[PDB]
Amino acid sequence: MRVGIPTETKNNEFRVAITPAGVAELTRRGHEVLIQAGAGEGSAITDADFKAAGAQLVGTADQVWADADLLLKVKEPIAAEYGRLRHGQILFTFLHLAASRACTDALLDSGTTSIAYETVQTADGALPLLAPMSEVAGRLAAQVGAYHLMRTQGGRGVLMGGVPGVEPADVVVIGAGTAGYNAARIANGMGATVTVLDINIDKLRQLDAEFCGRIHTRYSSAYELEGAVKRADLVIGAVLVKAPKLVSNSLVAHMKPGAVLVDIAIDQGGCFEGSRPTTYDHPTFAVHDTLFYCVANMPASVPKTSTYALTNATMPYVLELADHGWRAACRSNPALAKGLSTHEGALLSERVATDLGVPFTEPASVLA
Amino acid sequence: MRVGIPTETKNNEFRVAITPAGVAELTRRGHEVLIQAGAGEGSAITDADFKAAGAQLVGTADQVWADADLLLKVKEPIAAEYGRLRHGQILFTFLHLAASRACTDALLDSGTTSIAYETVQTADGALPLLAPMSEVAGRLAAQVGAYHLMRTQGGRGVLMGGVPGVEPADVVVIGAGTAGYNAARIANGMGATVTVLDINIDKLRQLDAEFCGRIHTRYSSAYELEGAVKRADLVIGAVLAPKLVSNSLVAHMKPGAVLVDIAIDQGGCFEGSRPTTYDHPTFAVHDTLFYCVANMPASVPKTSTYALTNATMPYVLELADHGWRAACRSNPALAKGLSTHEGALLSERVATDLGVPFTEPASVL
Amino acid sequence: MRVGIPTETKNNEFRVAITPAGVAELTRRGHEVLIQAGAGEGSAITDADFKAAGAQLVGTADQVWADADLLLKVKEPIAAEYGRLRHGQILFTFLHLAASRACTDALLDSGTTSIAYETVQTADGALPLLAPMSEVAGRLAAQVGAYHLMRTQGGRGVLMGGVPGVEPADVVVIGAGTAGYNAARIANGMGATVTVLDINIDKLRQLDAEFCGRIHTRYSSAYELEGAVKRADLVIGAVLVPGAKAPKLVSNSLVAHMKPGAVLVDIAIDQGGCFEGSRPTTYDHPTFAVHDTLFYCVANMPASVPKTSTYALTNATMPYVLELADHGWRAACRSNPALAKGLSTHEGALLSERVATDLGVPFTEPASVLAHH
Amino acid sequence: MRVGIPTETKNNEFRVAITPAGVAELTRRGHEVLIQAGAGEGSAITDADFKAAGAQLVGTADQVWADADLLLKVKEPIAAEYGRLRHGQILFTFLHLAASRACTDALLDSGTTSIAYETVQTADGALPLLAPMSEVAGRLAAQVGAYHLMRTQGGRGVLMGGVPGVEPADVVVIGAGTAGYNAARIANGMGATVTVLDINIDKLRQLDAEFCGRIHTRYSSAYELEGAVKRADLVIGAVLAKAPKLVSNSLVAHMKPGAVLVDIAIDQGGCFEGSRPTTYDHPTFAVHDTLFYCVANMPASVPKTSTYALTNATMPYVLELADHGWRAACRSNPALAKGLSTHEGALLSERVATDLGVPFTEPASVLA
Amino acid sequence: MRVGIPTETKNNEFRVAITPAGVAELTRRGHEVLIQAGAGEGSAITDADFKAAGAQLVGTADQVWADADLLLKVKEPIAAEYGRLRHGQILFTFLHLAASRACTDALLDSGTTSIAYETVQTADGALPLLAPMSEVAGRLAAQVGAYHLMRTQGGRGVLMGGVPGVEPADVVVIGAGTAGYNAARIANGMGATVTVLDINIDKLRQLDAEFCGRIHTRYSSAYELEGAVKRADLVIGAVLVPGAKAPKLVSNSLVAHMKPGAVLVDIAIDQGGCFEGSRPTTYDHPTFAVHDTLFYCVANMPASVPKTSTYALTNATMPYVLELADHGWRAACRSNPALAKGLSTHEGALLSERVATDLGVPFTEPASVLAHH
C-alpha cells in the first residue's frame, strides 16, 4: 500500500512522522512511501535523505493526503486539513480527541479510520508510543528549568550543581513515572540535590536502587509535598494519570522568590493550580514571586531527538498496518486496537464518547 | 576598621561582594560592616539577613564609600562612581585596568589604594579569586549550550542526553582547564557524549582517570581538533585568547550547531566571536549559532556571590585585621593584586599595556 | 532410574553435564548415576571425585548411552554419536536443531525423546538454561574480540580502551539480551565505545539505566545497523529468536564496506549465525577472512572456561534434571510448562514449531504427546 | 641488630608494633626479632604466626627491653615501664611528650634515644605515620556515629541511609583532612546525606570530584558551621598544636534532640567545647539534649586493622633504623630525623621544650 | 639537521617513531626528514603519506643511519643494527640499558650519543615518555592475561568476570604505577577480583579513592606478596625503579605453590623481569611453562596495537624531538633538565648512574658532558 507523511502544519511543530530508516523498511516490504517536500527539514532530514531511502517526494499536502492509504502524522489534523480527511484512509497520529470536539467531529463526519498514538496500550497498561515523548519531556524539563533558574531569565539565580563549597539547586520532581524519572536523572546529572515524590513505593525503590540513594525519595503526601515544595529552587510537575492539581496557588505563595515551576503535565490540564499552556515565544509567566514554565508540546523543541524517539516506537505498528490493513492489524494486536478512534462515522473510544456526550460504538463490533 | 559594601551598579550585575557569613566573621573580630540597603537583593540576600549577621544598613551609596576603610566590590567602579573614590581607602574588586584607561585614570586621580581580585596569584601560578568564576562559567556553559541546542532557539534540535535508542548530543570542549573540566562534567552528567581536546596530556590523563574513560580525551592536533568540531552539535571553547576555531572551519559544521565561547572575556577563542548580551545572547555565523555573553557568572548571582566571596574571605579578613601593607607583606599572593596607591600605578603589565609610568610594588611595601 | 553422562566429544569441549553435588543428590533420591571415565577431567572433576559422590564409572561411551534412561549432555550429539541415540531414552542437552537438518534427522530416526536446554522457557519468556551460557559467551566475546583486534592476530591494531588523548575501539553489539548485555558490559569495562542495537526498546531502556547512558543504544533498523557496522572496529552478533535460526542481519555486501582488520564475533553461530558470511568454526581454528575483516564463529564458546561454565550450567539445569529423574519426561513436562517448552523430539515426531517450519519438516503438537487419558 | 617488641600494657591497648610480614623482612635482612609471648593476640596474631615469620618469643617484658637495641611500641611507656628504659637503646613509638612531663622526664633521665611516630614528617608537611591512624579513626567515626544514633543508645533513632520514601540521616563532617575525608566517605557509603566543612577550597574541590557532587561541600565559617550543625543528626569533629573549639555548648543547645557528636580530635583537646576524653565501656555522655562520643584512641578498637595500617607505615623506617642505626638513618632521612625526641638526656623537640620549659638541644648538634 | 626514522626490526614491531604531522612540523622548521621506505606501514602510514608531509623516502636502513643527525626509533637497537650505530649521531629511542650489557657495550663502543625515552623525567618524578607505553602495556596485560586463562590456551579455564553465582578470576597486580593502575583498571572492568600491591602507600590511596575500595590494595612485603600470588589465577608484574634492572619479587619456588594453569604476565620484562623465571618472549612465541604455570614475557607489548600506540607515543615524544632537531642534544639538554635525565651514552661514557651501578660499569656524571667552556 501507499504510506503518506505530510509536513506538520501546527505552529512550531517541527517533528515528522517518519525517518529514512522507516522509509527504507516500508520500501523494502514493497510499500510505496509518499512524503511532502520539506516534511523532514525541521528534524534535519532533507528531501534527498528521504528519496535515497526510497520515498516519492510530492509538492503538495493534498497529493499526499489524496494518494495515501495510510496517513502518518505527529499531531492531530487542524482546521486547514479537515477537508483532506477521507473514507478508506487510515490516520495514525496523536489525536487527543477528548480535548477537541472539532477534531473528533471532523474525523467522524469524514468517515475516516483513525487510531491514536497515545491510547495504544500494552496489557501491562504501558503506553509505548507516548513513552518516548514522556522521556524527552522529562529530560527537557531539567534543562529548561536549569536555564530559567538564571536571574537573567527571572529565576532565583541559582546554578543547578553549585560549585565546590556552595549549595546546589534544590530540585523537587512530583511523580516517579517515565517523565518524572527522566527529569530527576538529568537534574541529578547536573549536580542538583533532587528529591522525587510518589505514592508508588515500588517506583521510589527503583530510584533508590538505580542512583544508590543519590536521588532522594519521599512518600508523597500533601504534607510532605508542601514541605518539599517550600524548600525547592526548581519544581517539576510530572504526574501522569485529567491531571490532579497538587500545587495550589496558596502553596506557591510560600515558595522562595524566583523559584521555577516546570509543568510537564500541561498536555492534560497541568498539575499546578496556576498552570496555563504557554508557547515558545512567551514560555513563562509569574505566579506570586515564582516563575511558571508550561509550554505545550515540549518535545517539539528538540525535533531531531523526538522524531527518532517517536518513530522508533511507532515503526512496528506502522509496518503491521501497512502489511495487514487496519482491521487485521488490530485483530492481531489488542494494544494497537486500544488506539482505535473512529471508523466510518463510529466513535470507537468509550472515554471520548462519554466526555463528549456522543454515542459510543464498541470496537469489537467494527472488527467484525 | 570599617568595611563597606555598596550595591553593584553595572547593568545586569546582581552579585554582591560579601555574604552574612563574611559579615559575622568581620563582626566577631570587632570590625564594623556597612552595607548599602538592597545590596544583597540580586543575590537573594535580604537586608535583614545582613543585619542579623551584624551589618549596619545605610541608605546611600555615598555614605558607604565615605565611611569605609576597606571597600569590597564585585566589578570595577564605573563613571558615576568615580567621584566616590578616595585616598586612604582600600578598594578590593575585579578591576581589569588594562581594558580601561578611564578607570585606571580615575583610580590614579583619586589617590585610592586598590587591589585587583583577578591578579591575586598564588606561588603555583593559580588565580584563586578568578577560579570560582571559571568553575561557575564552565558549568553554565553546559546548561546554556543545551538550551540553545533547541530548535526553538535556532539550534539544531538535539537533546543533550538523547533517550534510549536515540543519539545523544555530540559535545566538544576545547581546553581542559578549570572551566573546561567543569563544562565537560556538567555536559557529561546531562547525558551528552563529551570529548575534551587539549595538548597537555597530563590533564587529559586526569580526565580519563576521573570519569573512567567516559569523557573522551583527544590530544589536540589540527586533525583531531577539526574532525571533532565538524562532528559536534555543541562546542564549548574554554581555553584561557588564541583563535582555535576559524570561520572556515565553522563553514563545515552541522547546521544549527551551537558554539559557546567561555573565553569571550579575553577576546574569545573562536575566530567569529564578538561579545554579546543577555537580551541578545546569540548570533549567526554560517549555519551555526554563537553564544558569547560576557560575565556569564553574573547570571546566577546567588551561586556566584558565594563562590566569589568564599574565595575572597581569607584576604578580606587579613586586610581588615592588618591593613593593606602588613597584609601584602605577609602574603605575596595578595601583593600580586596591588594596582594603585596614592596616585601611583603598581602593575607593570597594566602600565605597559597602557603606555603609562609605573611604580614598582616593592617601592610601597 | 539410571542417569548417564558421557564425555563431551565436540572440538575442545571441556565442560561436563553434571558435578559431584548433582550426583550425590541424584544418588540420594535412589537413582543410579553412570559416568564415562574421564568425563569431568576438562572441568577438573576427577573420576575419584565422581565416584565418592555415588557414581559408577564406565569405560566406554557406548555403555553409558545403552544403560542410561536419562542421558545428560552439554552439546548436541555429533555424527559419531548418531548410532548411540536410543528409542526410550531421554536426551537433555543443548540441541540447536534449527541449525542442523542432520542432527534433527538422527534424533527423529532414532525414536529418542529429546528436550533442549535452550528452549526451556519460563512464563515471563526467560530461557533459564540458555542464560548462564549466554552470560559466559557474551563475556568471552568481548575479550576474544579485543584479542583479535591486535595487529599480531591479523586485526586492525587498535587497543580496546585507547589511552588518554587517543580514541578507543568502536564496538557495535547487535542484541541487548543476555549475551549482548554481557558483551557490552565487558567491552565497556575494557574502555571501548559501545553501541547496542535491539528491536526491543525496553532492553535498550534497561541498558541506558544500568550504565547511565555510557553504553549507547540504538533502535535496530537495517538503516541504523548498516551505519553502525560500517563505523565499527568490532561487531558482536548476539540476536536470538528462541528455537529459531538466526536472521542474517549483516550482509557480505556490508562487510565489504567495513574498516580493514575489523573483527566480527558471531555469538549466534550456534543457531546458524546472524552474519551472512558466518560458518561454524573451532577453538583449534577459530577465525577466517571475509573481505578485509576477520570472522570468529565458535559455536561452543563457554567450553574454554569450564571451571566457570560447568558450574554455571549445572547450577541452572540440576533442578530440572532432578524432576526428570524422579518422574520421567512426560510427568515432569506435565508438571512444568517451562520444561515442556524444551520438548524437541519423541518417537520420530518433531515437537518444535519454529524448528519444523525453519527446516521444512512436518510438525507435531507437544500437547498431543502430553494429553491426558 | 636486635629488634624487640613488648606487649602493649596501657588499658585497652590491643595493637602491636609489628606484624609477621615485618618480622620476616627484618629476619631476612639478618636482624633478630624478639617479641613478648602474647603480644599480637589482641590483633589476632598468635605467637605461632610470629614464630613462623622468624621471631624469637620470650616469656617476659623485662627480657625484651633488656636485649633489644631497637624497641618498637605503639603507645608511650607508662610509669611501670620507666625502669625498663635504657642508655644505648632506640625507642620508636607514639610519644606525645608535650602531654606528659612524667614520660618526657623518664626518657631524659634514662638517657634513651627516642623517636616519635607522630612527629616523623615529610617535606610536603604530611605526617605519614599518623596518617593511617587518622584513616582508621575517621572510618570508625562513621560506624560508631551510626550505632549511637539508635534510640536504644540514647540517640535520635535515625538510620544512616533511611529507606525508600524516608529521609536519611543528615551528617556534618567538620574538616576535610585525612580523618574527615574518611568519615565523609563511609557515612556517604552508608547512605547518609553528608556535608563537609573546610576552609581549604582545594580539599572541597577534591571531595566534589571524588564523589561527583554527592558529598556536599561548604566553605567553613562559624555562620555556615552553626547552620549545618543545627540541621545535623550526626556531627563528626575532624579538625587536625591544640584543636580549636568550633562547636560551643551554646550551639549544642540549639541542636536536634538526640543528635550525636563524635569528636575525633579528642586526642588533642577535642574540637567541641563540651568534649572530655571517654573510655570504651562509658563511651558517651549527654550535653544538653545531645550525645557526645569522645573515646580516646579509637583505632585501638580495631587492632587487627590498626596494627597493620600502622606497621605498614612504620616498616620502611624500622628497616632503616635496623639496617643503619639511629644516627645514620636520621642523617639520611630528614623525615625520620623530625621524629627525634630524646638522646642521652637531651630534649630534641623545640615544641616540647618550649611547652614544658626544658632546655632545647638542637637535633643537628646530636647528629654530629 | 637530518632527522632519520628507520623501520623497526624487533619481532612483530609495528610502531613507527614519527607520524606525517611530526614530519610536517620538522620540515616547516627547516629540517630534512629521512624515512626508510615502508617504516610506517605497520601503523597504516603509507610512504605516500610521509612523502606528502615532506619526508625523503630512502630505500635502505643503512642510508637512514648513515645520513641522520638525529635518529628516532621506538625500540633499542638489536644485534643486526649494532654496526649502524655512529659517533656524532643522536639516537633517541627506548633503551632499557640495565637489562642489556650487550646493547650498552654497543652504544659505548660506537661513541654515539643516546637518550632513552624511559629515563626522561620531569621534576615531579614522572616519566612522560614511558607513561603512554605503560598505559598501553597495562591495558594489554589484562586482555592477554584473560586470553591465556582459557583452557584452550593451556590456562586454568576461568572466566575473568565469572558469572552470577560463580566466582570470578583472582588477579594480583604488583606495582600501582602507570602500568599497574591500567592493568588493574582493565582487569576490574572485565569483572575480575583485583588486588594491587605497592610499597608506595600513596599509590594505594589513589587506587582506593578511584574505585571506592573495589580494587583491593595491599602494602607490598614479601610475606603479603607470597600469600597473594598463591591465591592468584593471574599475576601481573608491573614494578619499576626508573632506569634500573627490575627486582625479582616472584621466586620459582613461589611459582611452584601456585594454582595449576595460573598465568603470569611480566610487563617489567623490558627492564629484566620481576619474576625469577622470566625471560624475553616474542609475539610469535609469547608463553612458556614455569612449573605448572604459564609465563608471558613480551618486552614490546604495545607493538600489537600500533594504531593506538604509535600516536600515543609520538604525542609525547614529539615536543622533545623538535627541541633536539632545532638545537642539538647539548643545548636542548642544557635548557631542559627532564630531557637531560634521559642522557645515556656519549663518546664512550655511560651517563646513567643506575645503569652503571646495575651493569658494574664506570659512571660519568652527565653535568661533565653538559659543562660550559
Ligand SMILES: NC(=O)c1ccc[n+]([C@@H]2O[C@H](COP(=O)([O-])OP(=O)(O)OC[C@H]3O[C@@H](n4cnc5c(N)ncnc54)[C@H](O)[C@@H]3O)[C@@H](O)[C@H]2O)c1
Ligand atoms: N556460541 C556460543 O558458545 C553460544 C553460547 C551461549 C549462547 N549463544 C547464543 O547467543 C545468542 C543470544 O542469546 P541470548 O541468551 O542473548 O538471547 P536473548 O533472547 O536474551 O536476546 C536476544 C535479543 O536479540 C534481539 N533481536 C532479535 N532479532 C533482532 C533483530 N532482527 N535486530 C536486532 N535485535 C534483535 C531480541 O530482541 C533479544 O533482545 C543465541 O543464539 C544463543 O544461543 C551462543
Ligand SMILES: NC(=O)c1ccc[n+]([C@@H]2O[C@H](COP(=O)([O-])OP(=O)(O)OC[C@H]3O[C@@H](n4cnc5c(N)ncnc54)[C@H](O)[C@@H]3O)[C@@H](O)[C@H]2O)c1
Ligand atoms: N613490556 C612492555 O612492552 C612495556 C611497555 C611499557 C612499559 N613497560 C614497563 O612496565 C614497568 C612499569 O612501568 P610504569 O610506568 O608502571 O612505572 P611506574 O614508576 O609508574 O610504577 C612502578 C611502580 O612499581 C612500584 N614498585 C617499585 N618497587 C616495588 C617493589 N619492590 N614492590 C612493589 N612495588 C614496587 C613503585 O612504587 C611504582 O609505583 C616498567 O619496567 C616499564 O618499562 C613495559
Ligand SMILES: [Mg+2]
Ligand atoms: Mg506481518
Ligand SMILES: [Mg+2]
Ligand atoms: Mg639501606
Ligand SMILES: [Mg+2]
Ligand atoms: Mg627552540
